[PDB]
């Protein structure tokens, strides 16, 4: 799709560097608008970044740090909204790019708008043309007090701008790298313009620049894009008749999704009464799931019923991992509003309070769990337990909150033999990262493509047990598993049962008249009768 979601890993080193590049390729390829932060970190000199070439807009900040690449193709990057800021002040951070490797030219020849935040460029031994740019023109009129911390500590000489650059302001050595002013040359009080003339002034709702005086000639929208039209607000979903003021539905009504107006909220998103698309309901609301599959947020007049929150939400907002001091708060939870993280510190207790470490038996609390809204992060797991079968009833991981803004399912450094997530049939969003699990098999026996809900999703896997070793031993899907799809060994891990599933075990045929209490058939499920 045209819209992708950024990341949130910052300067933190990638757990799986062998798949770190394949992550970025799956997230941003074809993506034009980045909802969130564009973080490009720890990329080798031989990296192909040709998937970044379509990115026009970044909502959060842009982090380019610790890279060996000489070129980062962001020539189409038109605007950085900076709703989030690196270290809370910078909308564009370019740090420690080097080790000849090292960033040579920024080449942001379309970047003409930064709505909020400053620019941080430091410790780039190969970077040029950084100090040749009038950054005061890129910053918005409401952001003229934006900081600028730029270091020209170079270890190489730099050729001047191409003779075409009037004023010698460039993003590189080419003629196309010339910086096009769109603020400092405007006539009157224009925030943005296409020239020094008052007729060249652009509409107030335009952001990056204009091609005409219309509010449909913008390069970017200051607030919302209403189908080629830049507007302050989206058309409300409700129209009030000026007599009696009864609320009637608006046919032109639109939901606010990012900086654009949509007719219907995208997948895995919720619709509110205000008329917006969110991943989290407002205070004192409940998620009403329609029968067609769509979910919405509805406000409650009477105080809402007790809801089970996961990590990162409400009273578990600042809690790093699931321990034995919060394990009982997931008891009886069918749906968890938040995330579940299992770090090594989960299974070591608290001697000072005589609190026993989390026991493998207590993990059976999650047996009632059927849905996670956030993500599932497992970096530690009891060596005794051969699989994640305590989540055997888990059906959906929404991924409305992602680990490092990227992964909805992370399994790393575990001693599990198989997965055992027999009920998991959907990963609403985010990537899946399953790496460095020595004894783990039955990974390629999982129809991962069936679980994903968008093409920006994939499974990043490495350093697990070789499939050649798995098939060498008798570790294959059971005969009753349809199309060879299973989460583990035995007929109790089949994704699709070829015929007649009894209880949790797949059999070849139920005993309708064979002796086992005349088991009657009800939708491929064997059940006791009389």
């Amino acid at each position, epitope marked *: 799709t045209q819209v992708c979601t950024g990341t949130d890993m910052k300067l933190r080193l990638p757990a799986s560097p062998e798949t770190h590049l394949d992550m970025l390729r799956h997230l941003y390829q074809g993506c034009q608008v980045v909802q969130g932060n564009l973080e490009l970190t720890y990329l080798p000199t031989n990296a192909s970044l040709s998937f970044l070439q379509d990115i026009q807009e970044v909502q959060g900040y842009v982090l380019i740090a610790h890279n060996q690449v000489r070129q980062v193709p962001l020539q189409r990057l038109r605007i950085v909204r900076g709703t989030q800021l690196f270290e809370d002040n910078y909308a564009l951070a370019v740090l420690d790019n080097g080790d000849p490797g090292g960033l040579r030219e920024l080449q942001l020849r379309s970047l003409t708008e930064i709505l909020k935040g400053g620019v941080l460029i430091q410790r780039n031994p190969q970077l040029c043309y950084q100090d040749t740019i009038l950054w005061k023109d890129i910053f918005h009129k409401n952001n003229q007090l934006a900081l600028t911390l730029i270091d020209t500590n*170079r270890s190489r000489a730099c050729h001047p701008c191409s003779p075409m650059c009037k004023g*010698s302001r460039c993003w590189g050595e080419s003629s196309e790298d010339c910086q096009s002013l769109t603020r400092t040359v405007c006539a009157g009080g224009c925030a943005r313009c296409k020239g020094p003339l008052p007729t060249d002034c652009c509409h107030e709702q335009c952001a990056a620049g204009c091609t005409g005086p219309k509010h449909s000639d913008c390069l970017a929208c200051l607030h919302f894009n209403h189908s080629g039209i830049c507007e302050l607000h989206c058309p409300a979903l409700v129209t009030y008749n000026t007599d009696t003021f009864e609320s009637m539905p608006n046919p032109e009504g639109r939901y606010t999704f990012g900086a654009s107006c949509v007719t219907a909220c995208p997948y895995n998103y919720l619709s509110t009464d205000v008329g917006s698309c969110t991943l989290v309901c407002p205070l004192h609301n409940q998620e009403v799931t329609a029968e067609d599959g769509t979910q919405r947020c509805e406000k409650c007049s009477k105080p809402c019923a007790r809801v089970c929150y996961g990590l990162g939400m409400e009273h578990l907002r600042e809690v790093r991992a699931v321990t034995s001091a919060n394990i009982q708060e997931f008891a009886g939870c069918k749906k968890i509003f938040g995330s579940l993280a299992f770090l090594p510190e989960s299974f070591d207790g608290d001697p000072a309070s005589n609190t026993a470490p989390l026991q493998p038996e207590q993990l059976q609390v999650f047996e009632t769990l059927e849905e996670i809204t956030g993500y599932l992060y497992i970096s530690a797991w009891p060596d005794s337990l051969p699989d994640l079968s305590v989540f055997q009833n888990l059906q959906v991981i929404r991924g409305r909150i992602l680990h490092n803004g990227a992964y909805s399912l992370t399994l790393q450094g575990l001693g599990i033999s198989w997965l055992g997530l027999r009920s998991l049939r959907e990963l609403g969003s985010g990537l899946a990262l399953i790496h460095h699990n020595t004894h783990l098999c039955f990974v390629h026996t999982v129809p991962w493509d069936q679980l994903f809900r968008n093409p920006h999703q994939a499974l990043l896997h490495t350093a697990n047990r070789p499939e050649d070793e798995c098939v060498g031993e008798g570790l294959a899907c059971h005969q009753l598993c349809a199309r060879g799809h299973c989460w583990g060994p035995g007929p109790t891990q089949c994704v699709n049962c070829s015929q007649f599933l009894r209880g949790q075990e797949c059999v070849e045929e139920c005993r309708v008249l064979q002796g086992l209490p005349r088991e009657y058939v009800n939708a491929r499920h064997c059940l006791p009768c009389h």
Partner: antibody
Amino acid sequence: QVQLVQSGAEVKKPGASVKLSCKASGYTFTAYYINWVRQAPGQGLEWIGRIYPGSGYTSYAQKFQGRATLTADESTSTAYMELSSLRSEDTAVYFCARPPVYYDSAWFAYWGQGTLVTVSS
Amino acid sequence: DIQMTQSPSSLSASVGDRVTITCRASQSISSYLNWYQQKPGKAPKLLIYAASSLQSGVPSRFSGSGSGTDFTLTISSLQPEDFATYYCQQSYSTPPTFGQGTKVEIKR
């Protein structure tokens, strides 16, 4: 010809300010760093700061981070060096130079006919 | 700041003789040294930039060499037109510093 013409060879009162101009011609003025080097009578060279016209980016030394303001005009092609508070030790001949080929390199060719500045009462 | 020291401070030689001006740095410089020629009443001229690399227009009798701590400016054939105070400049880090100068005066 590529030339730099300086003006303002005068004497100023100790404590006052002084704005020395550096006219440029023969090349694209905004394409190269215009740095300033001073030299006291019968002394060595001392580097003050550099400035890139077209952007206005400046780089000063720790000795002149409080004074020595640098500017630039694309329309008049002038560097306009300016000290704030003069001392008896600030009596020198101020030059404006630029790199030959590269714009940011720290070797200076194409100097200008410097202007001497005397600071006495 | 990196302190640059030259040697000697003053020098005298006849026309045709060779001149060896040694420049010492108080820090390891990776051949980021520059040489100049300031005649009395005039602005300096870039003789040899970045150690060995000679400047266009400058006579070929001017050669530069050295790396790290010590360097060397060399005039294969001294001429009466070579009367000036010679400075060395480091271009390693801000701020670029100069030497005290070597006032070489020829002999007749």
